[PDB]
Amino acid sequence: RFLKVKNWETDVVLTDTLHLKSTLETGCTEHICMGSIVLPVRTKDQLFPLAKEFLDQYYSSIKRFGSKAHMDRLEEVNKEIESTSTYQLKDTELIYGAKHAWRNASRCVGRIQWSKLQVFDARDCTTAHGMFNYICNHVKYATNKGNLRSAITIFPQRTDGKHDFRVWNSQLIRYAGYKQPDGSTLGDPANVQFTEICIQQGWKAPRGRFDVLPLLLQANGNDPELFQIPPELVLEVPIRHPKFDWFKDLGLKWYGLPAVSNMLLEIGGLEFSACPFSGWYMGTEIGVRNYCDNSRYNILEEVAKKMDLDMRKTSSLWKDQALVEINIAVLYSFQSDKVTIVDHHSATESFIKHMENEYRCRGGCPADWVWIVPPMSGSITPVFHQEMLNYRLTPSFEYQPDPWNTHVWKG
Amino acid sequence: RFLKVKNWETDVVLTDTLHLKSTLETGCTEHICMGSIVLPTKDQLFPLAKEFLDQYYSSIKRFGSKAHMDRLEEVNKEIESTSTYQLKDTELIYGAKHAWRNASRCVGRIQWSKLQVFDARDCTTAHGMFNYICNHVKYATNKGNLRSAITIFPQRTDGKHDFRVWNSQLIRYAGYKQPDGSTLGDPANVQFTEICIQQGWKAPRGRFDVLPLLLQANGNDPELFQIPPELVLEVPIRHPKFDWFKDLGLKWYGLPAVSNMLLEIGGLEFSACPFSGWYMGTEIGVRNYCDNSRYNILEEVAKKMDLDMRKTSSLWKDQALVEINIAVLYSFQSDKVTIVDHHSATESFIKHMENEYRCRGGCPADWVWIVPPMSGSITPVFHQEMLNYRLTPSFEYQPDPWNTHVW
Numbered sequence: 044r045f046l047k048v049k050n051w052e053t054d055v056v057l058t059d060t061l062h063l064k065s066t067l068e069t070g071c072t073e074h075i076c077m078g079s080i081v082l083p084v085r086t087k088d089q090l091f092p093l094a095k096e097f098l099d100q101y102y103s104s105i106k107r108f109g110s111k112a113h114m115d116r117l118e119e120v121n122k123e124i125e126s127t128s129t130y131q132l133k134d135t136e137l138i139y140g141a142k143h144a145w146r147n148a149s150r151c152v153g154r155i156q157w158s159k160l161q162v163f164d165a166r167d168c169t170t171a172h173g174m175f176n177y178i179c180n181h182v183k184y185a186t187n188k189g190n191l192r193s194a195i196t197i198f199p200q201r202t203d204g205k206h207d208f209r210v211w212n213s214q215l216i217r218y219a220g221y222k223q224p225d226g227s228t229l230g231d232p233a234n235v236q237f238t239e240i241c242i243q244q245g246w247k248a249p250r251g252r253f254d255v256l257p258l259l260l261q262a263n264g265n266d267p268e269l270f271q272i273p274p275e276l277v278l279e280v281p282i283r284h285p286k287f288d289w290f291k292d293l294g295l296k297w298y299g300l301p302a303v304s305n306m307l308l309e310i311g312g313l314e315f316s317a318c319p320f321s322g323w324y325m326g327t328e329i330g331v332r333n334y335c336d337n338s339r340y341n342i343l344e345e346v347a348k349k350m351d352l353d354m355r356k357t358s359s360l361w362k363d364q365a366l367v368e369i370n371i372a373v374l375y376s377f378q379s380d381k382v383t384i385v386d387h388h389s390a391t392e393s394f395i396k397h398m399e400n401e402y403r404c405r406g407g408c409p410a411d412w413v414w415i416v417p418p419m420s421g422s423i424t425p426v427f428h429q430e431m432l433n434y435r436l437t438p439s440f441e442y443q444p445d446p447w448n449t450h451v452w453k454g
Numbered sequence: 455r456f457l458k459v460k461n462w463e464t465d466v467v468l469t470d471t472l473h474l475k476s477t478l479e480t481g482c483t484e485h486i487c488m489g490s491i492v493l494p495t496k497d498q499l500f501p502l503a504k505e506f507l508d509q510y511y512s513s514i515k516r517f518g519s520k521a522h523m524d525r526l527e528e529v530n531k532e533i534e535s536t537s538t539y540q541l542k543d544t545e546l547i548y549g550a551k552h553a554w555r556n557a558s559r560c561v562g563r564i565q566w567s568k569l570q571v572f573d574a575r576d577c578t579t580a581h582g583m584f585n586y587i588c589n590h591v592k593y594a595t596n597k598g599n600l601r602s603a604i605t606i607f608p609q610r611t612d613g614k615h616d617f618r619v620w621n622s623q624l625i626r627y628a629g630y631k632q633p634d635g636s637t638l639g640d641p642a643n644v645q646f647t648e649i650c651i652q653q654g655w656k657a658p659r660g661r662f663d664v665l666p667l668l669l670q671a672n673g674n675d676p677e678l679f680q681i682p683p684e685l686v687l688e689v690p691i692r693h694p695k696f697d698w699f700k701d702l703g704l705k706w707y708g709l710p711a712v713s714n715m716l717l718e719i720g721g722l723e724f725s726a727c728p729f730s731g732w733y734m735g736t737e738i739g740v741r742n743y744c745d746n747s748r749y750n751i752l753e754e755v756a757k758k759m760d761l762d763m764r765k766t767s768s769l770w771k772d773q774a775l776v777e778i779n780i781a782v783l784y785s786f787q788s789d790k791v792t793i794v795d796h797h798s799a800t801e802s803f804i805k806h807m808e809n810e811y812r813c814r815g816g817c818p819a820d821w822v823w824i825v826p827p828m829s830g831s832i833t834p835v836f837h838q839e840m841l842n843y844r845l846t847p848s849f850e851y852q853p854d855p856w857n858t859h860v861w
């Protein structure tokens with residue numbers, strides 16, 4: 044079967060066949076769409092088909108499908124599964140698999156970049172100290188003094204589900220949040236609960252507005268351990284505005300390195316529960332969401348007060364006005380310090396070229412419109428006007444429950 | 455089977471049960487989401503009639519009463535004998551209000567129970583259609599104090615006698631492709647303008663020419679009528695700070711009046727059912743003015759503001775966008791023509807969703823349409839999970855009449 048998508052600005056129509064390779068389920072049915080819902084231990088029996096389907100894809104991609112090497116590898120994996128209940132990926136398969144999980148991530152606007160990903164194989168790691176070292180090397184490499192390079196570090200896969208590797212941080216670099224007795228929050232409200240865990244685990248909190256959190260790292264199902272990232276490895280950008288000289292005195296800064304650490308990477312039915320990955324920011328992530336969400340730094344009012352905007356009626360668009368100036372400030376600041384960042388115009392235009400290329404060479408590009416459209420100025424970006432199809436391909440990144448909810452404390 | 459929706463700003467979780475009463479199909483499957491796609495007999499009729507009459511009688515707390523049973527009987531008898539049936543006035547009004555209540559793409563549904571219904575089922579000719587539509591236009595406009603209204607022409611019979619308003623909205627501007635290669639006016643209406651010209655309209659050939667109505671009665675060939683100019687309330691666009699803004703020569707009409715949809719009530723199909731409310735400011739300022747395939751004015755405005763248009767990263771487009779939208783709202787407000795900004799409208803919709811969840815067990819909503827086309831995440835709907843599903847009575851898209859009509 045063929046599915047068509049239309050761009051309503053260009054009338055360009057594309058045809059999807061790749062959706063036929065999807066088997067995992069969406070949340071939707073013929074009677075309900077769950078497109079805006081945020082969140083909508085394996086047998087031998089289920090594992091070999093998953094391994095086979097992955098190795099078939101890998102061997103096709105290298106133009107060796109049905110070769111002796113392909114068949115010998117299926118045979119070798121089959122025997123390893125029957126003998127040991129699992130199997131190990133070759134380094135080449137791991138690299139391919141991690142690049143493909145990114146290529147297949149339908150909520151990611153930055154996928155034009157998917158084939159340039161540095162993969163750090165950390166499957167020989169055994170302790171939380173070893174994980175700390177691996178993560179430092181990833182941060183230093185990816186940062187590259189501001190010229191950011193995408194990278195992922197892949198710790199040992201799940202075995203019985205009782206020996207998982209996990210990074211408890213949701214991203215490698217994040218700012219502490221502290222709920223005050225008077226109900227206000229100091230620092231980032233998104234990280235209050237994780238900050239509390241850190242403190243209980245014995246972190247000495249500086250209690251400021253931008254305290255970089257310590258890593259909490261679990262190796263081999265053991266209780267997690269605290270480590271502080273060397274501050275010299277944490278690149279930060281003070282935020283200022285090209286015209287408004289009072290903007291700097293808001294005291295805002297942000298970190299350069301966005302590095303998601305709470306997702307699970309599935310390749311060939313194997314589960315990598317600790318696979319931190321990093322790219323670079325699109326400016327709206329910081330300027331729109333991190334600064335302006337009501338439940339985050341929530342700076343809209345203070346900025347609009349300083350701009351002397353008419354704040355008595357929402358219809359003056361004061362919030363929209365302040366929003367744009369904050370976002371100019373973020374892009375200006377990153378650019379002035381030579382830290383990689385991309386604006387939402389450039390990123391979405393590149394995504395559309397990526398998507399057309401995918402349709403032409405791969406037969407499709409699963410994309411989640413709800414997430415791809417930027418959180419400001421939606422319809423003046425080309426993605427707003429682009430019909431998209433969302434479906435689930437493996438290899439994939441997946442959500443997983445936060446580890447403090449599931450961990451069995453050894454004590 | 456019982457579904458939860460969460461707001462990620464407030465942590466409020468609501469439980470949806472209303473979706474189980476859902477009838478039509480979404481276009482999604484378990485394998486593929488099509489959430490972003492813009493367009494995804496006597497025997498058939500009585501179940502549809504019964505489903506509707508049951509909900510109606512339920513709504514007036516008379517479910518299972520003799521009057522309920524008697525009406526179901528009357529309607530069964532009428533379909534068996536005539537192949538169709540007629541709605542009572544009370545039913546028609548309930549149906550129309552509920553079609554709006556059910557419109558998953560409409561942010562303005564807090565208003566759904568205040569809808570003036572004009573019953574034009576007695577209409578027989580296109581001149582009649584024109585008269586009904588002028589009265590709707592004048593009633594709804596109410597000298598700038600807009601009032602929601604729908605006018606309902608006769609229902610489909612054998613499908614060869616359809617009433618249709620050929621126009622996509624009662625009030626729209628002409629578009630003309632020029633020797634230049636550019637487009638004069640609204641590029642969204644080029645094809646329809648050509649049809650008008652073909653049918654005999656003398657086009658003034660300007661940037662903002664109000665199109666004539668093309669009305670089809672009883673499946674006859676459509677006829678042209680110009681809406682009295684004095685009934686079309688328009689607003690010149692100016693900016694409260696930028697003196698030069700007025701010289702762009704921009705204006706928009708005050709009354710948004712969708713005329714191309716099909717209203718389905720109790721299985722009956724009302725193919726001409728123009729309805730109107732009032733504008734959310736972004737509809738004009740973001741979409742009508744700034745879409746590349748619409749009036750596409752961003753460049754011209756940015757230039758008048760003397761922004762750095764060298765690099766996308768200076769956010770020149772974003773700056774100009776906010777200003778264009780400030781001007782739209784200020785102009786409508788100064789001239790006292792009802793308008794709502796996207797902040798106030800989405801705040802109201804969240805309140806309406808809570809009402810619907812508490813009082814009805816849910817609210818079908820299409821997030822892709824509900825979130826405004828600028829400043830998405832600074833409106834509360836962005837952080838609200840929504841479930842989209844199709845309830846009847848409903849408004850539905852239908853084929854453009856010119857592809858369907860035989861002359």
Ligand code: HEM
Nearest residue numbers: 145148150151152153156193194320321322323324325440
């Ligand atoms: C290289 C520059 C990149 C840019 C500009 C970028 C951009 C983005 C943005 C804006 C989002 C939405 C984030 C949000 O709203 O919180 C996102 C989501 C995501 N991206 Fe990327 N991305 C990049 C690289 C990467 C890399 C290297 C990977 C993995 C190898 C990745 C995988 C993902 C995944 C799995 C999501 C979904 C995250 C979630 O559900 O929490 N991206 N991307």
Ligand code: HEM
Nearest residue numbers: 554557559560561562565602603729730731732733734849
């Ligand atoms: C009273 C003020 C109203 C407001 C502020 C409002 C708001 C809106 C907005 C912003 C849209 C999206 C339009 C677009 O993006 O092109 C919309 C769509 C829609 N509304 Fe409303 N609305 C109002 C009244 C009504 C009424 C009175 C009805 C029916 C009686 C209605 C039914 C619909 C339907 C069916 C759609 C989807 C239209 C389509 O798919 O083309 N609305 N509404």
Ligand SMILES: Cc1ccnc(CCCCCO[C@H]2CNC[C@H]2Cc2cc(C)cc(N)n2)c1
Nearest residue numbers: 081082301302303320321322323324325328442
């Ligand atoms: C590699 C890269 C490049 C550019 N940006 C990034 C940062 C992405 C961070 C995502 C942060 O999102 C936070 C805030 N809201 C939901 C949460 C992420 C999330 C939450 C849930 C429940 C599910 C899910 N899939 N994803 C990473």
Ligand SMILES: Cc1ccnc(CCCCCO[C@H]2CNC[C@H]2Cc2cc(C)cc(N)n2)c1
Nearest residue numbers: 492493710711712729730731732733734737851
């Ligand atoms: C009553 C009211 C209140 C506020 N605004 C309005 C105006 C809505 C007009 C809708 C016109 O929009 C045009 C351009 N994009 C979608 C399209 C309407 C539409 C188009 C298509 C192809 C399908 C569909 N269901 N609906 C009406």
Ligand SMILES: C[C@H](O)[C@H](O)[C@H]1CNc2nc(N)[nH]c(=O)c2N1
Nearest residue numbers: 079080081413414836837838839
């Ligand atoms: C409820 C809704 O799906 C939620 O707020 C989503 C919307 N779109 C998003 N888009 C991105 N890129 N990131 C997000 O966190 C969200 N949040």
Ligand SMILES: C[C@H](O)[C@H](O)[C@H]1CNc2nc(N)[nH]c(=O)c2N1
Nearest residue numbers: 427428429430490491492822823
């Ligand atoms: C492809 C995509 O669905 C299309 O551009 C949509 C997005 N959201 C929209 N939202 C509204 N309110 N109106 C629209 O016309 C659209 N267009």
Ligand SMILES: [Zn+2]
Nearest residue numbers: 071076482487
């Ligand atoms: Zn869906």
